[PDB]
Design an enzyme around this catalytic site. Structure first.
Site, short mmCIF file in Angstrom:
data_model
loop_
_atom_site.label_atom_id
_atom_site.label_comp_id
_atom_site.label_asym_id
_atom_site.label_seq_id
_atom_site.Cartn_x
_atom_site.Cartn_y
_atom_site.Cartn_z
CG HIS D 88 -17.07 -12.90 -15.72
ND1 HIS D 88 -15.90 -14.03 -15.72
CD2 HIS D 88 -16.54 -11.74 -15.20
CE1 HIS D 88 -14.85 -13.30 -15.26
NE2 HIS D 88 -15.15 -11.99 -15.16
CB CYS D 130 -18.20 -19.75 -17.36
SG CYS D 130 -16.27 -19.71 -17.34
#
Lengths: 140, 91, 91, 140
Positions: D88, D130
């Site tokens: 992430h 991301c």
């Protein structure tokens, strides 16, 4: 195929912003050397085939407006677009005469959804400007 | 359908966070390096090949000549950000 | 002397500020595209040629399929940052 | 004279950091599919010639230590170094199991002045994560 299609009427526009002088309030000094850079850039990009345009001592609002209008012209017969920024800078940000403007907001005008006639065509931005204050001390 | 951010290339004269050097009589390093390479190879080299050689010339040929030793013998590396989807030749 | 920040390459899966998409059963978009190109061309193409073809496959072959229209039919472009000073072939 | 010298005994180390499961404190969900990615990455980067090692569900401290150590190994017989991060993320920043650590701090260990045996040799970072929350709506 794996190359950008270059079979167009024109190679494309080449907008040069040559910011040499800044308002005293910005605390920014005169960028000596920059006219020399702008003259050399202009001759190089003319030789490649671009229609070169040189703007000088631009305000922040001028930089946005002339970049926004260029985005709105019709590029259907152009292979690509180029812009060159010569100015003071700090990270994410370039100086006009007036003060500071984010680089992303200048380039956003040419996004696919905001400049359909440059869709699938290269949009080049060359940026001569500081991006901060760190120094690169080197190594032998 | 294609992404709105595709097909951009950003050739910055320096890496994020760093200074960019400008000779008052000879021009900024990145620009003079860029123009040299384009004069010799602009019509025969791919854009990344061009800018990689520019990276090399700025990295090797240039070192700041200054009196304040805070700025003595400093170096510079440019920084290419490519969202391009194809090779690009100016021909 | 050479710059301390020279000779880095960052192959990011997406541009600054944006999402990066992962199919729970097929893998993330960037990786499957990267492995595809590397399987076929890892030993014959230059690193920028490779990542540029990867940029292309992520831009064209992929579109998010989700029911929530906030995430319906979205796209992605990866982002290459090169401080390389030479061409790089894995051979 | 324009390519990186590749005549060494090893292509180099390839560290893959494959973060799938996260601590409840971070509130971030399981990255399903990430083990298909790592194994495909493993075969691809091995086939290229890298000495690949896959570390799983790493904390921030382990990621810094992993990369700091790799930086301190002896690379004289290596052509280059590669590191692959699957996790992430938010901009400038990568998640460990426990939380976030700046991407710049992971890579800085390989700066020329901090890793002489990789001087003038390519240092590659592939990063699947991301970088924010803007979305790319596309255009036909």
């Amino acid at each position: 195929t794996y190359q950008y299609n270059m079979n167009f009427e024109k190679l494309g526009k080449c907008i040069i912003i040559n910011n040499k002088n800044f308002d005293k309030v910005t605390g920014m000094g005169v960028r000596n050397g920059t006219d020399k850079d702008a003259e050399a850039l202009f001759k190089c990009f003319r030789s490649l085939g671009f229609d070169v345009i040189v703007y000088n001592d631009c305000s922040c609002a001028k930089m946005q407006d002339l970049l926004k209008k260029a985005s709105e012209e019709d590029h259907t017969n152009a292979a690509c677009f180029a812009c060159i920024l010569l100015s003071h800078g700090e990270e994410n940000v370039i100086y006009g005469k007036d003060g500071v403007t984010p680089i992303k907001d200048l380039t956003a005008h040419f996004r696919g959804d905001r400049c359909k006639t440059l869709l699938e065509k290269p949009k080049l931005f060359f940026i001569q400007a500081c991006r901060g204050t760190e120094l690169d001390d080197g190594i032998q | 359908k294609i992404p709105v951010e595709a097909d951009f290339l950003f050739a910055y004269s320096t890496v994020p966070g760093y200074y960019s050097w400008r000779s008052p009589g000879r021009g900024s390093w990145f620009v003079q390096a860029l123009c040299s390479i384009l004069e010799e190879h602009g019509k025969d080299l791919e854009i990344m090949q061009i800018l990689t050689r520019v990276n090399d010339r700025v990295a090797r040929h240039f070192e700041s000549q200054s009196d304040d030793p805070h700025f003595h013998e400093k170096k510079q590396i440019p920084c290419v950000v490519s969202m391009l989807t194809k090779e690009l030749y100016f021909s």
